[PDB]
Design an enzyme around this catalytic site. Sequence first.
Site, PDB file in Angstrom:
ATOM      1  N   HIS B  46       0.812  -1.212   0.012  1.00 32.42           N
ATOM      2  CA  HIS B  46       0.060  -0.032  -0.025  1.00 32.42           C
ATOM      3  C   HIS B  46       0.820   1.111  -0.115  1.00 32.42           C
ATOM      4  O   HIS B  46       0.438   2.189  -0.431  1.00 32.42           O
ATOM      5  CB  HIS B  46      -0.955   0.080   1.153  1.00 32.42           C
ATOM      6  N   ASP B  97      -0.374  -6.978   1.558  1.00 27.14           N
ATOM      7  CA  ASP B  97       0.012  -5.605   1.935  1.00 27.14           C
ATOM      8  C   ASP B  97       1.453  -5.975   2.182  1.00 27.14           C
ATOM      9  O   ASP B  97       2.061  -5.647   3.351  1.00 27.14           O
ATOM     10  CB  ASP B  97      -0.447  -4.958   2.991  1.00 27.14           C
ATOM     11  N   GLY B 196       2.843   6.155   7.992  1.00 26.29           N
ATOM     12  CA  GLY B 196       4.212   6.282   7.841  1.00 26.29           C
ATOM     13  C   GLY B 196       4.831   5.241   8.450  1.00 26.29           C
ATOM     14  O   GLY B 196       6.075   5.205   8.141  1.00 26.29           O
ATOM     15  N   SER B 198       4.001   2.183   8.057  1.00 24.14           N
ATOM     16  CA  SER B 198       3.625   1.202   7.076  1.00 24.14           C
ATOM     17  C   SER B 198       4.963   0.773   6.428  1.00 24.14           C
ATOM     18  O   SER B 198       5.767   1.492   6.031  1.00 24.14           O
ATOM     19  CB  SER B 198       2.554   1.794   6.129  1.00 24.14           C
TER      20      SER B 198
END
Lengths: 12, 246
Positions: B46, B97, B196, B198
């Site tokens: 993502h 993801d 952030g 992620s």
Amino acid sequence: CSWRGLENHAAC
Amino acid sequence: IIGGEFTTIENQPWFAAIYRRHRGGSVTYVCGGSLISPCWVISATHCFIDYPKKEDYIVYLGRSRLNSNTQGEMKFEVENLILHKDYSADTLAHHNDIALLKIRSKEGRCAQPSRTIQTIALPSMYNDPQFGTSCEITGFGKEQSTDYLYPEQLKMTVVKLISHRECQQPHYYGSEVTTKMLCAADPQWKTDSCQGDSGGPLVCSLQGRMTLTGIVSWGRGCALKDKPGVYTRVSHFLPWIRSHTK
């Protein structure tokens, strides 16, 4: 968008 | 990272700070990643899905700071930005993801392991720590949900793995959380990955080994009661990682 998952997203 | 602590890359030397160069040349931080091999940073799809052009990305390893150089840091272009073809993201959950960034410095080199640049072991497949296991998450993500800025300094925190049962509870994430995800949260919900973060590592010690158990993937808000951080459960993507890093 202030959420994880929308980092570096076009919108957001 | 909401709460937790500042850290430096030495404490998460597989942590990859992934930035995107914008047309206009501005470079924004995108996401964390984890160096899982010298050439391979694993992150969250993502993080890149909207800008899947590898050339836009800059990966730093050995970076403790978001917008300043960390001595010994390595800058990489992304030779391959491999997004998970089964990535999906509605509503909240980000499925599959997981992203791989084959990193290549302008010298055509991968990560050179150093004090600040180390790989993180992938979990053995479907081998995750038990729920309640404290794992660390690292990132430059927001320190507060309401923050506009990312911390300049890498942060880490510890979140505890939440069972899928707990996490799919409707008041948690219901069916948004899949078995290919790991929920982790602080018991007080006081600390968490946040925006952030992620792509960054959820590292658990699967005993004895610092293990990239999770990739910061998604969550409703951050450090929100009943809203764990959701992490790509890396141990459920080894075939994918394998099939893409070979």
